[PDB]
Write a protein that holds these residues in place. Structure first.
Motif, PDB file in Angstrom:
ATOM      1  N   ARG A  49       0.786  -1.185   0.000  1.00 47.66           N
ATOM      2  CA  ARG A  49       0.000   0.000   0.000  1.00 47.66           C
ATOM      3  C   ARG A  49       0.833   1.256   0.000  1.00 47.66           C
ATOM      4  O   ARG A  49       0.537   2.135   0.834  1.00 47.66           O
ATOM      5  CB  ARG A  49      -1.081   0.042   1.009  1.00 47.66           C
ATOM      6  CG  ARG A  49      -2.040  -1.171   0.620  1.00 47.66           C
ATOM      7  CD  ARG A  49      -3.313  -0.880   1.312  1.00 47.66           C
ATOM      8  NE  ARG A  49      -4.366  -1.838   1.071  1.00 47.66           N
ATOM      9  CZ  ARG A  49      -5.008  -1.789  -0.057  1.00 47.66           C
ATOM     10  NH1 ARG A  49      -4.805  -0.795  -0.930  1.00 47.66           N
ATOM     11  NH2 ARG A  49      -6.130  -2.529  -0.254  1.00 47.66           N
ATOM     12  N   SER A  50       1.801   1.272  -0.883  1.00 49.09           N
ATOM     13  CA  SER A  50       2.841   2.345  -0.898  1.00 49.09           C
ATOM     14  C   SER A  50       3.379   2.533  -2.240  1.00 49.09           C
ATOM     15  O   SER A  50       3.300   1.597  -3.094  1.00 49.09           O
ATOM     16  CB  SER A  50       3.939   2.049   0.146  1.00 49.09           C
ATOM     17  OG  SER A  50       4.675   0.866  -0.197  1.00 49.09           O
ATOM     18  N   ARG A  51       4.024   3.634  -2.401  1.00 54.28           N
ATOM     19  CA  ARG A  51       4.450   4.016  -3.774  1.00 54.28           C
ATOM     20  C   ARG A  51       5.748   3.322  -4.051  1.00 54.28           C
ATOM     21  O   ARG A  51       6.565   3.187  -3.065  1.00 54.28           O
ATOM     22  CB  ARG A  51       4.563   5.537  -4.104  1.00 54.28           C
ATOM     23  CG  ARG A  51       3.262   6.232  -4.098  1.00 54.28           C
ATOM     24  CD  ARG A  51       3.386   7.589  -4.521  1.00 54.28           C
ATOM     25  NE  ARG A  51       2.124   8.281  -4.643  1.00 54.28           N
ATOM     26  CZ  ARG A  51       1.956   9.490  -5.201  1.00 54.28           C
ATOM     27  NH1 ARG A  51       2.769   9.901  -6.194  1.00 54.28           N
ATOM     28  NH2 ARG A  51       0.751  10.116  -5.133  1.00 54.28           N
ATOM     29  N   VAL A  52       6.048   2.965  -5.271  1.00 55.69           N
ATOM     30  CA  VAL A  52       7.368   2.434  -5.710  1.00 55.69           C
ATOM     31  C   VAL A  52       7.939   3.131  -6.894  1.00 55.69           C
ATOM     32  O   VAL A  52       9.021   2.750  -7.238  1.00 55.69           O
ATOM     33  CB  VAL A  52       7.322   0.945  -5.919  1.00 55.69           C
ATOM     34  CG1 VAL A  52       6.972   0.199  -4.575  1.00 55.69           C
ATOM     35  CG2 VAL A  52       6.356   0.591  -6.987  1.00 55.69           C
ATOM     36  N   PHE A  53       7.213   4.083  -7.607  1.00 56.66           N
ATOM     37  CA  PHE A  53       7.822   4.694  -8.739  1.00 56.66           C
ATOM     38  C   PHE A  53       7.182   6.010  -9.044  1.00 56.66           C
ATOM     39  O   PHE A  53       5.900   6.048  -8.851  1.00 56.66           O
ATOM     40  CB  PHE A  53       7.818   3.750  -9.920  1.00 56.66           C
ATOM     41  CG  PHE A  53       8.444   4.310 -11.136  1.00 56.66           C
ATOM     42  CD1 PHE A  53       9.838   4.368 -11.262  1.00 56.66           C
ATOM     43  CD2 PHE A  53       7.666   4.683 -12.234  1.00 56.66           C
ATOM     44  CE1 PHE A  53      10.401   4.815 -12.377  1.00 56.66           C
ATOM     45  CE2 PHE A  53       8.248   5.074 -13.400  1.00 56.66           C
ATOM     46  CZ  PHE A  53       9.592   5.190 -13.478  1.00 56.66           C
ATOM     47  N   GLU A  54       7.837   7.004  -9.370  1.00 56.66           N
ATOM     48  CA  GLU A  54       7.367   8.380  -9.836  1.00 56.66           C
ATOM     49  C   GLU A  54       7.793   8.641 -11.227  1.00 56.66           C
ATOM     50  O   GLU A  54       8.885   8.187 -11.646  1.00 56.66           O
ATOM     51  CB  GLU A  54       7.730   9.540  -8.948  1.00 56.66           C
ATOM     52  CG  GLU A  54       7.033   9.518  -7.628  1.00 56.66           C
ATOM     53  CD  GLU A  54       7.433  10.694  -6.667  1.00 56.66           C
ATOM     54  OE1 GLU A  54       8.417  11.353  -6.944  1.00 56.66           O
ATOM     55  OE2 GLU A  54       6.463  11.142  -5.983  1.00 56.66           O
ATOM     56  N   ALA A  55       6.868   9.219 -12.052  1.00 57.21           N
ATOM     57  CA  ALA A  55       7.190   9.651 -13.327  1.00 57.21           C
ATOM     58  C   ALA A  55       6.397  10.642 -14.042  1.00 57.21           C
ATOM     59  O   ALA A  55       5.170  10.354 -14.118  1.00 57.21           O
ATOM     60  CB  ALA A  55       7.349   8.441 -14.275  1.00 57.21           C
ATOM     61  N   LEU A  56       6.900  11.640 -14.624  1.00 54.63           N
ATOM     62  CA  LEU A  56       6.068  12.769 -15.108  1.00 54.63           C
ATOM     63  C   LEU A  56       5.985  12.434 -16.548  1.00 54.63           C
ATOM     64  O   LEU A  56       7.017  12.466 -17.264  1.00 54.63           O
ATOM     65  CB  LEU A  56       6.634  14.144 -14.930  1.00 54.63           C
ATOM     66  CG  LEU A  56       5.923  15.322 -15.353  1.00 54.63           C
ATOM     67  CD1 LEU A  56       4.577  15.472 -14.575  1.00 54.63           C
ATOM     68  CD2 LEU A  56       6.816  16.491 -15.395  1.00 54.63           C
TER      69      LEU A  56
END
Lengths: 101, 86, 426, 426, 426, 426, 101
Positions: free
Chosen positions: B74-81
């Motif tokens: 229940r957590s983030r693993v990747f960011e991308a714009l």
């Protein structure tokens, strides 16, 4: 009289086997066994003296055993202590006496 | 959709990660203010890709950011714009 | 509220402050709309001309997940995210006020419980944190290889100061690492704080002198006012005492954080007690769960905390929430969130509760090396306790499973040990 | 337990403290044996060698009455009495830790709730009490014969300190008597404390200048540590701020006691809020009840206290407990014993939570002049608030019963008050 | 501009301030006008009404000598004179902003440098200069007949306090005179400043007990704020340390001048590191040469300074600038101007960077007795390094040439020293 | 090296810090190993026994990207990430010491220039940042919707305090808001600082009295010593001064940060100057690019900053970087990464250097309303300048393109402004 | 006498046309207006009296003009200001007089 030290100091003098076994313990968990001495024991004195290295390439307990035998040969009139460090956890999980003058 | 985003979402889906999207205009974006987008409730790559492109089309000329979600943690693993107004 | 405060799709940012609810809505109130509300009354409270001069959307609590509670009726799991900006820097009291201050009164919820909070690494860094932490504390004390034993001097009150140093003297010199004040000992007229402190300091000096190992006592400085706290703490620092006591529950978070910042400045350790703990986490239907408190305290700063005697699942859940640097999210252990910590020095837990010396094998296999175990009393008794600890440790280091053969090891220690025999008999 | 602790044939003294518990024993555990256990867990806990060096009976808290709860089964009241020597002088925190520091956690009680305390006089008069007292407070503001008015800025967050002043100013100028900072607003990045204080003081002074009436705002002073809180408060004093706001549950009592004493020294009204009280007191059957908290605070010292929007009987009960010098025992209103404060002044109750100004006549008739009220929003809006107040009070004074005549009064008032005409149309 | 700012026939007064510029102008721009512009930009910038209200001439930076660079094209040397008036007393910072505040923004110079300054003796005397000086240092430490030896502890980061002081002890015991931090190591999450002082002091005191020689480490007291730095340095003195470390390019000149005043007042040695010096000196075309910074720093005040492992002429030039009271001009060595110091004491050079003990006899040659050798490492290595120090000094004093006989000295010394034999065999 | 430090497969974390290097290796050194050597230099330098007591991998700078520069030969960008433990909280100093403490001093790279850093939010959260922010500064000054006008006092030196306050007054009354102390002016013997402070204070008051604008003067407080800088700072607030000036390069970072924090505690704006920068940044091929320096300062805390008269594109890049809360990676404007501040407030930009008021419209367009323009000096001249600003902003409000119509605007404004007409005539 | 005010004061007294242009730019900017008045004008005095609300559901300048003309008719001896505020930015972006006594 009754001077104690931090861990296992209460118990009877560790014979070779139990020192070995604990070395083993350190080995599975990768606590490379660091051997140090001092000529006396006072709680204020944080620092003791190393036996020329920590035994990083120790494949067996007996090598460190034999080291400590050398150390006793040269400074049998001194106290010997052994430590193990979790460099991954940066924690000293081990320190205890294996010899007394 | 660009090739490099397609290969990204591929990799994300292959690991078993869920897909989410968030949108905001150029002001909101500046203020790090994102908004929820419509759910992409599908593990199939085609359906994911189609819903992503529909969402992109929904919010023309606004910042869109793609993300990778591990449902178990229940957590983030990747960011991308992924998209920008121009 | 749903349409603006319930965001099922919302993915909670690394920097967010995540909060995990267990709420039971009043009949007629659906779970979703209950969660939306719970969100709303904790951040905004609800067309005032003042609102459109603001970015309401930017500070809203985005309730991003609700899910029914397994094996139970009328209880659901809501997760709410909160921007990092919502909370004041350095201030536990602040986040407490913002989280657990008002939404507690919302009539429509039959029963409400926040369980977990994900402290983002950024809001983690900001705090002074604990004053020494696990490993530096162990080093200052020179103590390694075994958990730190502790004993509660008795009776809780009535004892004279002089006798209070007699009791410390015996208990520590028997071999025990620290001795703890009773939380109901602060300055009381039969025992005035300065004399207590003087005498204890004498006693630890002698004891450490005659055993030659670090001794301390958790000399409680909880005073009605910051100034008085500070005075007892300064005069304690003149004494070479390694540690004090503060009651973060009944004193307060602000007092604690002052004291800890001073102590870090001052090279003296920090003990905590949890008087009223039960008042907040006991019931199964309401409150904040003790994990979030232990996490909050570690945040605010402390070297020691009680965690009880041993639910074991979530017990060790919070033990880990107060020891490691990295823990993965585990429902079954109470760890509703994943927790990264930027190497913040961890804290030492303090098991206590009349620990039943024979129970110690499992206690150690539970608490490991890194912990503090505390005894709810005479010098031979501490001798036997120390013996037994060293033996149990010894056996654990051998690979033997303490669980199974705990009585057998205690036994093995027993034959050469008179005092351990005198105890094991009891 | 039932043998030593439980003394129904004991005579409590004026020197002793009493505590009221509504406790339901675990099954198998009788009512009496549970009340004794509850005495035990909070006074002495439960043989060692330090026991006989002391006079144990000197230091026992005594339960002297049990009865079942009316209209409830297996629920009983353990009335419990304690010595005077137990506590540090003037220490809320000490007392809390003595009584409630160990009793909440013992398994034998299913839902204990701390209902009410009785502080002995000799103990009561060692405090400072509230920094001025209702009478001096009212003298300082110079306002007589009516309750006071707070308003909490909205929205909670995002407002610029410049907007935040501008919303304050509108609040006061339309005829409010107070604005109140929110308990969460302490130093957020979008408002840092010091700017806010500067602009509030400027706004207060200009509202004073336009209006010709003393104005006060509730500047939050909850600060992460003692040094911040000190600095902050000094700064507010520099601007001549007559009044401040502290949060005591999260912050604790030690720090509130310090602030109260400093304010005593420096002339500064102390507004109070109860954030997180709903955690501790909402649950009926378990927790601690807010009048205990109020009594502790009034020992420590505070000019104001929130007490709810509104059991209407228990409300007036502890309302009275916080206002008058001596109260009697009244179970219909929840008051359980006869109290003496020995000239320690009162604290203003404050009303909040959507007070709904067409509910105003009921509010006055419930409390009257000696209170404060808090509206959930414009200068005209506050003017209508104002007009309603003054018509309500007038009609009260005239001997017209408010309860019945409200909407007619408000009417009549609105006929000549267009701003109140709008407030009534809405 | 040349008719205002070019005065070839001008004799600088000894009360002026001379700064040497290496510059390459833009094509088209003549060298003389370019140097006039460089003069004008700094002393006056450039017309306004105010200008005639002052003595223009009195506040002018006079180009009195321009030459080209021998064996170089489109390059020349400018010497500019600045009256004493223009500058503040005791402010290295003022000096740096006047000389080098904006001139390196001036467009027409393709590249610019300052090679050297001559600080008038009058302007000298306003500074406190080094806290103690080489001779006062060398007396207080007791260390005579050799240059001093240092061991930068490794690894830079990660090392715990406890381990840190362990390794300090070791290396110090081996016979090294001091130990340093890496410039990076003050309060990293793994390691807290205060505990590290405390550890280090224990180690030093143990070393001094056993060895019988003054021991010290270089205690990086640099701190985010003057309050913190003050703190850390006050603390360090409480413990009885002889020396500290601090970093001037990074932290700031002002903080230095402060710290030098305080240590001057409190009898503590100060050692300096030069981190970012490369960002000002490296290239051969643009920056400010290291010599100038060293000049400025000794002005500000310090006892040690890093000076590189070791162009060899430049090294010998500015080390002598920082060593001797009088220096005569030498363009081979790059000393642009004759300088005096009216007996203001000198500073100790430092060289570090894994100095290759085989090259150590050259280093004693180059540097001379009054110097420090740092070493980028265990007890036996430290012994072998000391004994080599000996052997080389002794040999020098025998009259044997060091450079020709370095290998014979080392090996002959090693014939009786296992530790030095071992070292050499690497 | 490349094997150990260069990992092209590694993904940078939000918890990691990034550093951009435009590097051209020495001949024979490939670009990839060159980046390897750089990465090794700035964190670790590069065996010893201590080394295997830690976790090298936890403390390892990672270069994940190397690419040749477009249109340049032998030029490449090393992007190197950095963990979250290497540094201390809240210290610019420690940062620069870690990143740039020795990397610049290495051999293998013929020139190295640090182009860009990317701080992890975790570190961004640990400083105080700018005292107030742009928004709050505009609130304090009450001025909105345009940029700010400042003028620097000429000639830089010689002016008497009496004269200097005359000139101040004239610049201010004519309509400029801000006055700048030329950098080198701190305490020079012809102008003692304290008499300057008073005269400014009394000139600004009286200007404010006539004009009915809040004025401010830039008050350089940069001092020889921490004590002295503080004193002059108290005495500046004591006259109600709202803004002061300091140097972060020459005086340094510890002093600046201490001053910013104190200002934060004392409600005073803090302008910055950039002095000594172009020793560091003028070289396109070596040094540090001013985006990094700005970024470090904006962590440190300061209201204003110099950014040049005006590469246009890179200008805008680091301009928006110092104002804007979150920025994207864009190479055309020289921003190499995507950054967030987590709500740390903005800094106004400042330009200077002969602004030629008939160049104003381009300047407004390129900058906009959030900037301050600083001008190299009579009241009519200030009147013309203010006029030209007001006309420009109006016209931009109208939708008229500034670029095309600047000259027609200015002329139209001048036809009714004789001050501006004359200003145009020259 | 020589009394100026914050913004656009040094240009000729802003007139209804130019007011309309400025109002329009404010509108397409999306910043919801606020009008404000007082008897006097003090820099050191932060806050004035807003025109009983801010305008939020604003379509035309001409209504803003009507209100200004109203608040002249009621406060013809006071100063009237127009202020524009970006919420997203949290910055007051506009603040200029539209009346003098």
């Amino acid at each position: 009289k009754e001077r104690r030290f931090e861990t296992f100091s209460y118990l009877p003098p560790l014979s070779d086997r139990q020192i070995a076994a604990q070395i083993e313990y350190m080995i599975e968990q990768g606590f490379h066994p660091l051997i140090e001495f001092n000529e006396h024991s006072n709680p204020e004195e944080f620092y003791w003296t190393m036996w020329k290295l920590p035994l990083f390439d120790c494949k067996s307990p007996q090598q460190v055993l034999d080291e400590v035998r050398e150390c006793r040969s040269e400074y049998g009139d001194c106290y010997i202590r052994v430590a193990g460090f979790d460099n991954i956890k940066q924690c000293q999980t081990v320190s205890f006496i294996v010899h007394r003058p | 959709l660009s090739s490099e985003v397609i290969t990204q979402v591929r990799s994300l889906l292959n690991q078993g990660y869920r897909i989410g999207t968030e949108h905001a205009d150029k002001r909101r974006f500046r203020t790090s203010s994102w908004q929820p987008c419509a759910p992409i409730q599908s593990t199939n790559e085609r359906q994911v890709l189609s819903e992503l492109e529909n969402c992109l089309s929904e919010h023309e000329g606004e910042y869109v950011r793609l993300l990778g979600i591990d449902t178990n943690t229940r957590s983030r693993v990747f960011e991308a714009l992924i998209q920008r107004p121009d | 509220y749903k349409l603006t405060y319930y965001t099922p799709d919302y993915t909670p940012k690394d920097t967010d402050l995540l909060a995990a609810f267990r709420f039971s809505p009043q009949p007629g109130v659906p779970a979703d709309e209950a969660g939306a509300a719970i969100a709303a009354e904790s951040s905004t409270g609800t067309t005032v001309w003042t609102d459109l001069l603001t970015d309401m959307d930017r500070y809203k609590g985005k309730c991003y997940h609700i899910e029914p509670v397994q094996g139970e009726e009328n209880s659901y799991f809501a997760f709410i995210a909160y921007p990092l900006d919502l909370f004041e820097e350095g201030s536990v009291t602040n986040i407490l006020t913002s989280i657990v201050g008002n939404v507690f009164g919302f009539k429509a919820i039959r029963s409400l419980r926040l369980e977990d909070i994900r402290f983002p690494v950024a809001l983690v860094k900001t705090f002074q944190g604990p004053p020494h932490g696990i490993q530096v504390e162990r080093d200052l004390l020179n103590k390694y290889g075994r958990p730190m034993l502790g004993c509660t001097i008795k009776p809780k009150l009535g004892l004279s100061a002089k006798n209070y140093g007699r009791a410390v003297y015996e208990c520590l010199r028997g071999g025990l690492d620290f001795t703890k004040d009773d939380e109901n000992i602060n300055s009381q007229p039969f025992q005035r704080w300065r004399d207590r402190f003087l005498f204890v300091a004498d006693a630890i000096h002698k004891s450490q002198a005659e055993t030659g190992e670090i001794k301390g006592h958790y000399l409680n400085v909880t005073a009605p006012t910051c100034e008085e706290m500070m005075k007892r703490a300064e005069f304690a620092k003149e004494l070479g005492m390694p540690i004090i006591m503060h009651d973060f529950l009944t004193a307060g978070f602000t007092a604690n954080t002052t004291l800890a910042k001073w102590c870090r400045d001052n090279g003296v350790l920090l003990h905590i007690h949890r008087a009223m703990h039960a008042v907040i986490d006991r019931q199964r239907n309401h409150g904040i769960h003790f994990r979030v408190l232990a996490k909050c305290l570690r945040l605010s700063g402390g070297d020691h905390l009680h965690s009880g005697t041993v639910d074991k699942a979530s017990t060790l859940g919070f033990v880990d929430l107060m020891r490691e640097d990295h823990i993965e999210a585990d429902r079954s252990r109470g760890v509703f969130f994943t927790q990264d910590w930027a190497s913040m020095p961890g804290v030492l837990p303090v098991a206590s509760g009349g620990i039943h010396v024979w129970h110690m094998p499992a206690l150690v296999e539970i608490f490991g090396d890194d912990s503090v175990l505390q005894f709810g009393g005479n010098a031979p008794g501490a001798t036997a306790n120390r013996v037994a600890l060293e033996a149990c440790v010894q056996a654990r280091n051998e690979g033997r499973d303490l669980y199974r053969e705990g009585g057998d090891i205690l036994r093995e220690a027993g034959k050469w040990s008179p005092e351990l025999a005198a105890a094991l008999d009891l």
